[PDB]
Amino acid sequence: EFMKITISGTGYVGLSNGVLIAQNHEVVALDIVQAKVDMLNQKISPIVDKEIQEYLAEKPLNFRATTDKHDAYRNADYVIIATPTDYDPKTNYFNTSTVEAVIRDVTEINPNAVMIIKSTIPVGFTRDIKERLGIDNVIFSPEFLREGRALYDNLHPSRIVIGERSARAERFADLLKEGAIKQDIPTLFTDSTEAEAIKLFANTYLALRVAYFNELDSYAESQGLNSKQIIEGVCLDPRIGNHYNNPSFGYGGYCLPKDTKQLLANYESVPNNIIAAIVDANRTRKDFIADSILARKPKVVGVYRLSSIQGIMKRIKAKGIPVIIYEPVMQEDEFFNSRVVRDLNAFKQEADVIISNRMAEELADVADKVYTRDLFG
Amino acid sequence: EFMKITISGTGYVGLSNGVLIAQNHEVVALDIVQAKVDMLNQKISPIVDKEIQEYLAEKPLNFRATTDKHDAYRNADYVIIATPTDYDPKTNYFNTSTVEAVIRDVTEINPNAVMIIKSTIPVGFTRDIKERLGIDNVIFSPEFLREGRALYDNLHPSRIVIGERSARAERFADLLKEGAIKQDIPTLFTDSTEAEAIKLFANTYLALRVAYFNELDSYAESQGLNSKQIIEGVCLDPRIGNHYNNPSFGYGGYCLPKDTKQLLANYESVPNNIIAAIVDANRTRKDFIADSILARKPKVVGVYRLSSIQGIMKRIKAKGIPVIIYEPVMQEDEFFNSRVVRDLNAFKQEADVIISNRMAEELADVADKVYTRDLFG
Ligand SMILES: NC(=O)C1=CN([C@@H]2O[C@H](COP(=O)(O)OP(=O)(O)OC[C@H]3O[C@@H](n4cnc5c(N)ncnc54)[C@H](O)[C@@H]3O)[C@@H](O)[C@H]2O)C=CC1
Ligand SMILES: NC(=O)C1=CN([C@@H]2O[C@H](COP(=O)(O)OP(=O)(O)OC[C@H]3O[C@@H](n4cnc5c(N)ncnc54)[C@H](O)[C@@H]3O)[C@@H](O)[C@H]2O)C=CC1
Ligand SMILES: O=c1ccn([C@@H]2O[C@H](COP(=O)(O)O)[C@@H](O)[C@H]2O)c(=O)[nH]1
Ligand SMILES: O=c1ccn([C@@H]2O[C@H](COP(=O)(O)O)[C@@H](O)[C@H]2O)c(=O)[nH]1
């Protein structure tokens, strides 16, 4: 087979999948930003990913880009939708407008193309949109990549999951396996809504794991015990393992805080204690960490690098204690009403306690006033 | 070195450790039950463990037993304490009387022996007892074996943890490594109280993991989704894994229900949400399972095999629905006021719904009225 696969959205997800598949098939990448398309046609990547830029520039890929929807979608066997979406936990609103616009466009231009959604969507999205528009050609397949290793994670994926049990779903899984470097990749075919719930449950388990080791750490600090001794002893049980067990100021990042809340909203009519506790536990852990810091009676707290550390900052400021921030990447001189100190040495002198989620070489000479719960970094 | 190691308590734990060490050193096993000692001296095991009976009967072990404390403890380099203890969650009482009696006896008879406690004790026990009696010769080392594979788990241990950082603790770890079949066993030396908390945190993580996959299963049932599809997709993430993820009526057994509660009691002054939720989650899961069963409006519920299933039974009976029990191992004709039916066929005919924690071959012909959440058994 030599198929045509269109990518809608040339960001980390679209380009990871597109470059992977362009090694063996015809890929046409569609974006709405003409300048990104022009760059791609010059074999220049519009994003930061080593492998994508290396592949685009150095390997023979049957790849091209366009802003023309008709040129992109005509004769496509599959269209991978990788446009932006966003879930807002405060309102429980999942903005899927770009995905719905693409489904609209493909349905109109090429109703025979099979759309594969890689964008994050709410649980039940695909079953519902098919029913609403009265179409059958949409399948969800979760994307497991990490930014910065976008192409790498699809060259060496943990597994491939396609949310339809059919020969056309299997042929799509084959495209992902064919472009990968890793061999005998675990492949799983499920029904739609089930596939859409996988990442929420996987990411929430990771947040649960971090929240648990953080509660173990709260206990160890409270009791004057060596947290590393306990954690290493526990994690030597092969059913538990030595990963994702490094204490911190709370789970953070781009996915976990929102996904745990998104999953909890989905449990609104399902009795549970663990799902709700995962969200509450992070707030409790931040209160514990802030209270530990405040018990040292600092006159100035220094925050070394800026994300769960933001919650610690908020709590310290709520008690009227000034916070100064060391963050080279930030160019402003203020962040949430607190001074950003550009000079590391001045920051070190002024701060009575320096908090940092993870230890860093450059804090070694002031280690005595650094508060971090990092054990394994 | 060729040392003398005394075992106090010849049950699963004492005999596993004693037979292991008797392969290379002089072991004298002490019990209070003369008949168990007499059996041991005839090379007959007083417990059910294949490897222990095989080793006792067929390998050249420098092993003997006695009820004489003086004969047992004199000249011992180490005394492994493996007497019964019990934690009662209702009262938060940990009965360590047998361990304290042995410490008393050893201190009096041979104050130079180094005691290694393998019995389960409360967190902080060893530090406190040393301080109370003004002695230094007591060290806690957790025991990770499973009944039925008692000797096997010490021939192939996950890891060895000794709750003292010293050369004498290391020499004890060496005895455990020397008798084992498994090589390069992970070995960890910690301070006392830290070692004593390891199993509670490890077992509570296992209960948390089961409670989490059970909440995922509650959601799947509630939403009409295929739980196996979701769980397999999630567990293919290598940070999560395909173990301890089989839905059930709640975590049960001999250790998890009590250890989770014991750990929660230890968190009485430590802010947390996850530790308390692990206990509450099991009650919620049992309520969900019972409610699912009751929604089928059965006139008689059959319970196939008797332990979290007991909680389901209690809840069904609380609603006035009769329960019948199929449990060949039980000889009584009543269990908690419910009929025990000896004949499997009569049990099958009468029960409108048959609940079972795990599926079983012999329920195949009535599969249509069996309710089990088992996926991987
Ligand atoms: N970045 C990540 O780590 C992961 C992201 N995802 C999901 O994948 C989707 C895309 O994420 P990214 O690749 O990071 O987005 P991105 O923002 O890096 O790239 C999105 C691209 O879509 C283009 N675009 C916007 N509307 C469009 C339309 N109607 N038609 C064609 N192109 C359009 C944008 O101009 C942009 O180039 C989101 O739903 C995201 O949540 C999934 C797994 C990992
Ligand atoms: N069975 C298990 O799965 C595990 C048990 N443990 C702990 O190890 C300890 C022992 O458990 P088991 O071996 O299963 O007990 P067991 O009940 O099978 O054997 C205990 C032995 O100690 C004897 N004994 C009682 N008082 C004594 C005394 N003052 N001096 C000498 N012997 C005495 C009893 O007669 C009996 O033979 C407990 O603290 C238990 O919680 C730890 C890990 C696993
Ligand atoms: O051992 C760990 C692993 C991860 N995290 C936190 O969980 C979130 C997700 O981490 P990652 O999977 O993006 O690396 C991040 O805030 C990370 O700091 C921890 O606190 N400890
Ligand atoms: O996948 C699993 C693994 C264990 N358990 C439960 O957790 C408790 C401890 O199991 P084990 O570690 O003794 O096998 C038992 O009630 C067991 O049924 C489950 O429900 N699902």
mmCIF file of N, CA and C in Angstrom, chain A residues 123 158-159 165 186 188 190-191 193-194 198 200-202 204-206 208-209 211-212 215-216 218-219 222 225-226 229-230 232-234 236-240 243-244 263 266-267 270-275 277-278 280-281 284 288, chain B residues 123 158-159 165 186 188 190-191 193-194 198 200-202 204-206 208-209 211-212 215-216 218-219 222 225-226 229-230 232-234 236-240 243-244 263 266-267 270-275 277-278 280-281 284 288:
data_model
loop_
_atom_site.group_PDB
_atom_site.id
_atom_site.type_symbol
_atom_site.label_atom_id
_atom_site.label_comp_id
_atom_site.label_asym_id
_atom_site.label_seq_id
_atom_site.Cartn_x
_atom_site.Cartn_y
_atom_site.Cartn_z
ATOM 1 N N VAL A 123 -14.016 12.795 27.085
ATOM 2 C CA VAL A 123 -14.472 11.429 26.997
ATOM 3 C C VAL A 123 -15.888 11.367 26.439
ATOM 4 N N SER A 158 5.397 3.625 23.646
ATOM 5 C CA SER A 158 5.050 2.697 24.700
ATOM 6 C C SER A 158 4.067 1.657 24.133
ATOM 7 N N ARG A 159 3.054 2.172 23.442
ATOM 8 C CA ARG A 159 2.045 1.301 22.781
ATOM 9 C C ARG A 159 1.288 2.160 21.778
ATOM 10 N N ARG A 165 -12.403 -1.031 16.469
ATOM 11 C CA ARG A 165 -12.030 -2.427 16.212
ATOM 12 C C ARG A 165 -12.504 -2.709 14.783
ATOM 13 N N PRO A 186 3.369 -2.936 21.374
ATOM 14 C CA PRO A 186 2.080 -3.426 21.889
ATOM 15 C C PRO A 186 0.982 -2.613 21.195
ATOM 16 N N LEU A 188 -3.289 -2.074 20.708
ATOM 17 C CA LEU A 188 -4.546 -2.383 21.339
ATOM 18 C C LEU A 188 -5.685 -1.689 20.593
ATOM 19 N N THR A 190 -9.696 -0.755 20.740
ATOM 20 C CA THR A 190 -10.800 -0.646 21.697
ATOM 21 C C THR A 190 -11.944 0.060 21.010
ATOM 22 N N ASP A 191 -13.055 0.150 21.741
ATOM 23 C CA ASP A 191 -14.138 0.969 21.245
ATOM 24 C C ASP A 191 -13.820 2.432 21.576
ATOM 25 N N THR A 193 -15.185 5.388 23.188
ATOM 26 C CA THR A 193 -15.197 6.117 24.473
ATOM 27 C C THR A 193 -14.118 5.572 25.419
ATOM 28 N N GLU A 194 -13.947 4.262 25.369
ATOM 29 C CA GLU A 194 -12.867 3.613 26.169
ATOM 30 C C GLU A 194 -11.519 4.194 25.795
ATOM 31 N N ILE A 198 -8.411 6.643 28.250
ATOM 32 C CA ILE A 198 -7.101 6.070 28.675
ATOM 33 C C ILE A 198 -6.130 7.062 29.260
ATOM 34 N N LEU A 200 -6.601 10.014 30.539
ATOM 35 C CA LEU A 200 -7.037 10.593 31.810
ATOM 36 C C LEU A 200 -6.729 9.628 32.962
ATOM 37 N N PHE A 201 -7.069 8.358 32.789
ATOM 38 C CA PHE A 201 -6.812 7.376 33.869
ATOM 39 C C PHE A 201 -5.330 7.133 34.034
ATOM 40 N N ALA A 202 -4.546 7.172 32.957
ATOM 41 C CA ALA A 202 -3.115 6.927 33.138
ATOM 42 C C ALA A 202 -2.469 8.127 33.817
ATOM 43 N N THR A 204 -3.879 10.339 35.693
ATOM 44 C CA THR A 204 -4.355 10.498 37.062
ATOM 45 C C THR A 204 -3.660 9.466 37.955
ATOM 46 N N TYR A 205 -3.347 8.283 37.431
ATOM 47 C CA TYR A 205 -2.619 7.331 38.262
ATOM 48 C C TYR A 205 -1.235 7.934 38.543
ATOM 49 N N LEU A 206 -0.591 8.553 37.551
ATOM 50 C CA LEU A 206 0.707 9.153 37.830
ATOM 51 C C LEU A 206 0.622 10.260 38.879
ATOM 52 N N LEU A 208 -1.600 10.385 41.201
ATOM 53 C CA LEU A 208 -1.890 9.693 42.445
ATOM 54 C C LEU A 208 -0.592 9.161 43.038
ATOM 55 N N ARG A 209 0.257 8.645 42.171
ATOM 56 C CA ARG A 209 1.516 8.051 42.648
ATOM 57 C C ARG A 209 2.383 9.162 43.262
ATOM 58 N N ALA A 211 1.329 12.025 44.446
ATOM 59 C CA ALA A 211 0.645 12.537 45.655
ATOM 60 C C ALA A 211 0.892 11.549 46.822
ATOM 61 N N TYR A 212 0.946 10.262 46.515
ATOM 62 C CA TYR A 212 1.153 9.284 47.587
ATOM 63 C C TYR A 212 2.575 9.407 48.154
ATOM 64 N N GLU A 215 2.723 12.307 50.304
ATOM 65 C CA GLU A 215 2.167 12.177 51.643
ATOM 66 C C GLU A 215 3.116 11.356 52.511
ATOM 67 N N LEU A 216 3.780 10.389 51.917
ATOM 68 C CA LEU A 216 4.762 9.625 52.685
ATOM 69 C C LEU A 216 5.850 10.638 53.163
ATOM 70 N N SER A 218 5.508 13.946 53.647
ATOM 71 C CA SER A 218 4.926 14.828 54.674
ATOM 72 C C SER A 218 5.064 14.119 56.042
ATOM 73 N N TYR A 219 4.678 12.853 56.085
ATOM 74 C CA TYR A 219 4.802 12.061 57.276
ATOM 75 C C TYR A 219 6.273 11.988 57.739
ATOM 76 N N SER A 222 7.359 15.338 59.183
ATOM 77 C CA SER A 222 6.643 15.547 60.414
ATOM 78 C C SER A 222 7.215 14.730 61.575
ATOM 79 N N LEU A 225 11.925 11.644 60.231
ATOM 80 C CA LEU A 225 12.483 10.452 59.633
ATOM 81 C C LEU A 225 13.130 10.771 58.273
ATOM 82 N N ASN A 226 13.994 9.855 57.840
ATOM 83 C CA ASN A 226 14.695 9.955 56.575
ATOM 84 C C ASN A 226 13.783 9.379 55.482
ATOM 85 N N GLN A 229 15.269 6.712 52.981
ATOM 86 C CA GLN A 229 15.388 5.352 53.487
ATOM 87 C C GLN A 229 14.076 4.628 53.297
ATOM 88 N N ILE A 230 13.000 5.317 53.667
ATOM 89 C CA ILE A 230 11.673 4.655 53.564
ATOM 90 C C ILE A 230 11.312 4.425 52.086
ATOM 91 N N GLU A 232 13.174 4.237 49.390
ATOM 92 C CA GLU A 232 13.963 3.208 48.718
ATOM 93 C C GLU A 232 13.536 1.794 49.169
ATOM 94 N N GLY A 233 13.230 1.622 50.455
ATOM 95 C CA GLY A 233 12.821 0.314 50.948
ATOM 96 C C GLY A 233 11.524 -0.149 50.349
ATOM 97 N N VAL A 234 10.583 0.783 50.276
ATOM 98 C CA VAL A 234 9.273 0.524 49.677
ATOM 99 C C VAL A 234 9.394 0.206 48.170
ATOM 100 N N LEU A 236 11.778 -0.922 46.403
ATOM 101 C CA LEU A 236 12.471 -2.145 46.033
ATOM 102 C C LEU A 236 11.473 -3.299 45.896
ATOM 103 N N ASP A 237 10.206 -3.093 46.274
ATOM 104 C CA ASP A 237 9.180 -4.120 46.021
ATOM 105 C C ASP A 237 8.960 -3.973 44.488
ATOM 106 N N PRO A 238 9.144 -5.053 43.680
ATOM 107 C CA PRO A 238 8.967 -4.975 42.233
ATOM 108 C C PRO A 238 7.559 -4.652 41.796
ATOM 109 N N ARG A 239 6.583 -4.792 42.680
ATOM 110 C CA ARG A 239 5.202 -4.390 42.308
ATOM 111 C C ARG A 239 5.046 -2.875 42.419
ATOM 112 N N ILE A 240 6.046 -2.198 42.988
ATOM 113 C CA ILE A 240 5.934 -0.738 43.180
ATOM 114 C C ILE A 240 6.926 -0.022 42.271
ATOM 115 N N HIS A 243 10.463 4.296 40.241
ATOM 116 C CA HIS A 243 10.222 5.447 39.355
ATOM 117 C C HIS A 243 9.113 6.286 39.931
ATOM 118 N N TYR A 244 8.966 7.534 39.453
ATOM 119 C CA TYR A 244 7.910 8.433 39.898
ATOM 120 C C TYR A 244 7.679 8.371 41.384
ATOM 121 N N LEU A 263 -10.903 14.396 35.046
ATOM 122 C CA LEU A 263 -11.421 13.064 35.394
ATOM 123 C C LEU A 263 -12.379 13.166 36.567
ATOM 124 N N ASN A 266 -15.690 14.077 35.504
ATOM 125 C CA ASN A 266 -16.372 12.956 34.861
ATOM 126 C C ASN A 266 -16.965 11.974 35.856
ATOM 127 N N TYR A 267 -16.505 12.060 37.111
ATOM 128 C CA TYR A 267 -16.981 11.206 38.198
ATOM 129 C C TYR A 267 -18.084 11.873 38.987
ATOM 130 N N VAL A 270 -20.486 9.207 39.984
ATOM 131 C CA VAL A 270 -19.924 7.894 40.277
ATOM 132 C C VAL A 270 -19.288 7.985 41.656
ATOM 133 N N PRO A 271 -19.769 7.192 42.618
ATOM 134 C CA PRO A 271 -19.198 7.239 43.972
ATOM 135 C C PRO A 271 -17.710 6.952 43.955
ATOM 136 N N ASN A 272 -16.931 7.770 44.641
ATOM 137 C CA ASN A 272 -15.484 7.544 44.656
ATOM 138 C C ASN A 272 -14.907 8.275 45.862
ATOM 139 N N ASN A 273 -13.690 7.876 46.248
ATOM 140 C CA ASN A 273 -12.938 8.625 47.240
ATOM 141 C C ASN A 273 -11.543 8.931 46.677
ATOM 142 N N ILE A 274 -10.964 7.991 45.949
ATOM 143 C CA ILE A 274 -9.589 8.193 45.453
ATOM 144 C C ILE A 274 -9.531 9.279 44.388
ATOM 145 N N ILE A 275 -10.453 9.286 43.432
ATOM 146 C CA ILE A 275 -10.339 10.340 42.398
ATOM 147 C C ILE A 275 -10.401 11.754 43.016
ATOM 148 N N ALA A 277 -9.697 12.580 46.074
ATOM 149 C CA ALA A 277 -8.544 12.779 46.948
ATOM 150 C C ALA A 277 -7.285 13.154 46.227
ATOM 151 N N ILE A 278 -7.147 12.732 44.965
ATOM 152 C CA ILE A 278 -5.962 13.069 44.218
ATOM 153 C C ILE A 278 -5.860 14.599 44.051
ATOM 154 N N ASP A 280 -7.518 16.912 46.020
ATOM 155 C CA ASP A 280 -7.391 17.541 47.331
ATOM 156 C C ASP A 280 -5.983 17.377 47.919
ATOM 157 N N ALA A 281 -5.394 16.207 47.691
ATOM 158 C CA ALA A 281 -4.067 15.886 48.223
ATOM 159 C C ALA A 281 -3.028 16.913 47.772
ATOM 160 N N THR A 284 -3.397 19.983 49.900
ATOM 161 C CA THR A 284 -2.905 19.676 51.262
ATOM 162 C C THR A 284 -1.369 19.642 51.351
ATOM 163 N N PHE A 288 1.117 21.969 53.466
ATOM 164 C CA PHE A 288 2.117 21.419 54.380
ATOM 165 C C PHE A 288 3.507 22.011 54.105
ATOM 166 N N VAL B 123 5.243 1.130 64.203
ATOM 167 C CA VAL B 123 6.302 2.038 63.834
ATOM 168 C C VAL B 123 6.839 2.768 65.059
ATOM 169 N N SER B 158 12.777 -10.175 47.226
ATOM 170 C CA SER B 158 12.714 -8.937 46.482
ATOM 171 C C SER B 158 13.917 -8.063 46.882
ATOM 172 N N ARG B 159 14.112 -7.956 48.193
ATOM 173 C CA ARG B 159 15.264 -7.194 48.746
ATOM 174 C C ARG B 159 15.417 -7.594 50.207
ATOM 175 N N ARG B 165 22.374 0.714 60.618
ATOM 176 C CA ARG B 165 23.514 0.959 59.729
ATOM 177 C C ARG B 165 24.753 0.660 60.577
ATOM 178 N N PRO B 186 19.154 -6.919 46.202
ATOM 179 C CA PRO B 186 19.229 -5.506 46.608
ATOM 180 C C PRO B 186 19.220 -5.479 48.139
ATOM 181 N N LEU B 188 19.483 -2.972 51.664
ATOM 182 C CA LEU B 188 19.345 -1.603 52.090
ATOM 183 C C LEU B 188 19.460 -1.519 53.611
ATOM 184 N N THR B 190 18.980 0.960 56.868
ATOM 185 C CA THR B 190 18.307 2.201 57.257
ATOM 186 C C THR B 190 18.372 2.314 58.761
ATOM 187 N N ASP B 191 17.871 3.449 59.251
ATOM 188 C CA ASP B 191 17.719 3.569 60.683
ATOM 189 C C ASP B 191 16.430 2.844 61.088
ATOM 190 N N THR B 193 13.303 3.301 62.880
ATOM 191 C CA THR B 193 11.884 3.659 62.679
ATOM 192 C C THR B 193 11.526 3.656 61.186
ATOM 193 N N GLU B 194 12.475 4.116 60.387
ATOM 194 C CA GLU B 194 12.293 4.082 58.906
ATOM 195 C C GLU B 194 12.052 2.660 58.443
ATOM 196 N N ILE B 198 8.374 0.644 56.419
ATOM 197 C CA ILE B 198 8.387 0.212 54.992
ATOM 198 C C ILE B 198 7.206 -0.621 54.566
ATOM 199 N N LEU B 200 4.253 -0.971 55.881
ATOM 200 C CA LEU B 200 2.980 -0.251 55.906
ATOM 201 C C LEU B 200 2.829 0.595 54.635
ATOM 202 N N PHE B 201 3.871 1.331 54.276
ATOM 203 C CA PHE B 201 3.786 2.183 53.065
ATOM 204 C C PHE B 201 3.738 1.336 51.814
ATOM 205 N N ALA B 202 4.413 0.188 51.785
ATOM 206 C CA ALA B 202 4.357 -0.612 50.561
ATOM 207 C C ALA B 202 2.987 -1.261 50.432
ATOM 208 N N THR B 204 0.202 -0.286 51.734
ATOM 209 C CA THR B 204 -0.841 0.710 51.517
ATOM 210 C C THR B 204 -0.790 1.174 50.058
ATOM 211 N N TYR B 205 0.392 1.221 49.448
ATOM 212 C CA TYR B 205 0.429 1.593 48.039
ATOM 213 C C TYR B 205 -0.293 0.486 47.256
ATOM 214 N N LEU B 206 -0.077 -0.787 47.597
ATOM 215 C CA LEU B 206 -0.788 -1.832 46.873
ATOM 216 C C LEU B 206 -2.303 -1.724 47.036
ATOM 217 N N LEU B 208 -3.870 1.031 47.585
ATOM 218 C CA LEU B 208 -4.237 2.222 46.839
ATOM 219 C C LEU B 208 -4.370 1.870 45.364
ATOM 220 N N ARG B 209 -3.455 1.044 44.894
ATOM 221 C CA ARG B 209 -3.460 0.686 43.466
ATOM 222 C C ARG B 209 -4.739 -0.112 43.164
ATOM 223 N N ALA B 211 -7.520 -0.061 44.887
ATOM 224 C CA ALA B 211 -8.685 0.832 45.078
ATOM 225 C C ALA B 211 -8.827 1.740 43.832
ATOM 226 N N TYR B 212 -7.706 2.134 43.248
ATOM 227 C CA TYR B 212 -7.785 3.014 42.079
ATOM 228 C C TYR B 212 -8.371 2.256 40.878
ATOM 229 N N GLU B 215 -11.944 1.958 41.324
ATOM 230 C CA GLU B 215 -12.756 3.128 41.021
ATOM 231 C C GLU B 215 -12.854 3.303 39.509
ATOM 232 N N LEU B 216 -11.800 2.964 38.800
ATOM 233 C CA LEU B 216 -11.870 3.035 37.342
ATOM 234 C C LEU B 216 -12.999 2.053 36.895
ATOM 235 N N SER B 218 -15.652 1.021 38.681
ATOM 236 C CA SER B 218 -16.958 1.574 39.083
ATOM 237 C C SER B 218 -17.430 2.537 37.969
ATOM 238 N N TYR B 219 -16.539 3.419 37.543
ATOM 239 C CA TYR B 219 -16.827 4.336 36.477
ATOM 240 C C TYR B 219 -17.206 3.578 35.186
ATOM 241 N N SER B 222 -20.665 2.032 35.540
ATOM 242 C CA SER B 222 -21.630 3.100 35.583
ATOM 243 C C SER B 222 -21.911 3.696 34.201
ATOM 244 N N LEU B 225 -19.115 1.079 29.858
ATOM 245 C CA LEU B 225 -17.892 0.917 29.106
ATOM 246 C C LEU B 225 -17.204 -0.416 29.455
ATOM 247 N N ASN B 226 -16.314 -0.833 28.559
ATOM 248 C CA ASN B 226 -15.542 -2.052 28.709
ATOM 249 C C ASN B 226 -14.302 -1.726 29.552
ATOM 250 N N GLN B 229 -10.761 -2.878 28.244
ATOM 251 C CA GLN B 229 -10.165 -2.061 27.197
ATOM 252 C C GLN B 229 -9.427 -0.901 27.822
ATOM 253 N N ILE B 230 -10.099 -0.262 28.776
ATOM 254 C CA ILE B 230 -9.465 0.926 29.405
ATOM 255 C C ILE B 230 -8.236 0.497 30.225
ATOM 256 N N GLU B 232 -6.335 -2.174 30.070
ATOM 257 C CA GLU B 232 -5.191 -2.614 29.277
ATOM 258 C C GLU B 232 -4.480 -1.416 28.611
ATOM 259 N N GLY B 233 -5.242 -0.432 28.134
ATOM 260 C CA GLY B 233 -4.637 0.726 27.493
ATOM 261 C C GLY B 233 -3.797 1.536 28.438
ATOM 262 N N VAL B 234 -4.338 1.730 29.634
ATOM 263 C CA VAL B 234 -3.640 2.455 30.696
ATOM 264 C C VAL B 234 -2.363 1.711 31.144
ATOM 265 N N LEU B 236 -0.489 -0.397 29.685
ATOM 266 C CA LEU B 236 0.586 -0.518 28.715
ATOM 267 C C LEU B 236 1.568 0.648 28.865
ATOM 268 N N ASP B 237 1.246 1.651 29.691
ATOM 269 C CA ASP B 237 2.221 2.716 29.982
ATOM 270 C C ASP B 237 3.213 1.982 30.931
ATOM 271 N N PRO B 238 4.532 1.920 30.599
ATOM 272 C CA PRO B 238 5.508 1.234 31.440
ATOM 273 C C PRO B 238 5.687 1.846 32.809
ATOM 274 N N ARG B 239 5.233 3.074 33.009
ATOM 275 C CA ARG B 239 5.308 3.664 34.371
ATOM 276 C C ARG B 239 4.170 3.131 35.239
ATOM 277 N N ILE B 240 3.221 2.416 34.632
ATOM 278 C CA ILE B 240 2.062 1.921 35.403
ATOM 279 C C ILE B 240 2.126 0.402 35.511
ATOM 280 N N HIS B 243 0.257 -5.183 36.278
ATOM 281 C CA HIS B 243 0.085 -6.020 37.476
ATOM 282 C C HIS B 243 -0.835 -5.317 38.438
ATOM 283 N N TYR B 244 -1.369 -6.047 39.432
ATOM 284 C CA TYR B 244 -2.244 -5.480 40.450
ATOM 285 C C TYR B 244 -3.230 -4.493 39.886
ATOM 286 N N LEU B 263 -1.713 2.450 59.155
ATOM 287 C CA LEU B 263 -0.982 3.619 58.644
ATOM 288 C C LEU B 263 -1.812 4.876 58.827
ATOM 289 N N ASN B 266 -1.474 6.224 62.142
ATOM 290 C CA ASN B 266 -0.181 6.881 62.322
ATOM 291 C C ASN B 266 -0.147 8.287 61.750
ATOM 292 N N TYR B 267 -1.123 8.594 60.887
ATOM 293 C CA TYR B 267 -1.253 9.908 60.259
ATOM 294 C C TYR B 267 -2.202 10.801 61.024
ATOM 295 N N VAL B 270 -0.852 14.265 60.825
ATOM 296 C CA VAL B 270 -0.170 14.634 59.589
ATOM 297 C C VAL B 270 -1.250 14.880 58.547
ATOM 298 N N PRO B 271 -1.334 16.102 58.013
ATOM 299 C CA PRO B 271 -2.362 16.402 57.004
ATOM 300 C C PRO B 271 -2.251 15.475 55.810
ATOM 301 N N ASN B 272 -3.367 14.913 55.380
ATOM 302 C CA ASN B 272 -3.320 14.004 54.232
ATOM 303 C C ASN B 272 -4.726 13.902 53.655
ATOM 304 N N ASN B 273 -4.802 13.434 52.404
ATOM 305 C CA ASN B 273 -6.082 13.087 51.813
ATOM 306 C C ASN B 273 -6.001 11.659 51.257
ATOM 307 N N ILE B 274 -4.864 11.296 50.685
ATOM 308 C CA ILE B 274 -4.755 9.966 50.056
ATOM 309 C C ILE B 274 -4.776 8.851 51.093
ATOM 310 N N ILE B 275 -4.042 8.988 52.192
ATOM 311 C CA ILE B 275 -4.066 7.865 53.158
ATOM 312 C C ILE B 275 -5.496 7.585 53.670
ATOM 313 N N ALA B 277 -8.283 8.342 52.191
ATOM 314 C CA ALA B 277 -9.120 7.903 51.077
ATOM 315 C C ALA B 277 -8.966 6.454 50.728
ATOM 316 N N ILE B 278 -7.790 5.877 50.993
ATOM 317 C CA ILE B 278 -7.585 4.483 50.687
ATOM 318 C C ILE B 278 -8.555 3.613 51.512
ATOM 319 N N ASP B 280 -11.459 4.767 53.000
ATOM 320 C CA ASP B 280 -12.835 5.087 52.636
ATOM 321 C C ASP B 280 -13.232 4.483 51.282
ATOM 322 N N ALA B 281 -12.287 4.487 50.347
ATOM 323 C CA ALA B 281 -12.528 3.983 48.992
ATOM 324 C C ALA B 281 -13.009 2.533 49.020
ATOM 325 N N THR B 284 -16.651 2.510 49.930
ATOM 326 C CA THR B 284 -17.428 3.033 48.785
ATOM 327 C C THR B 284 -17.575 2.012 47.644
ATOM 328 N N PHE B 288 -20.883 0.310 46.152
ATOM 329 C CA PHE B 288 -21.208 0.347 44.727
ATOM 330 C C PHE B 288 -21.531 -1.056 44.192
#
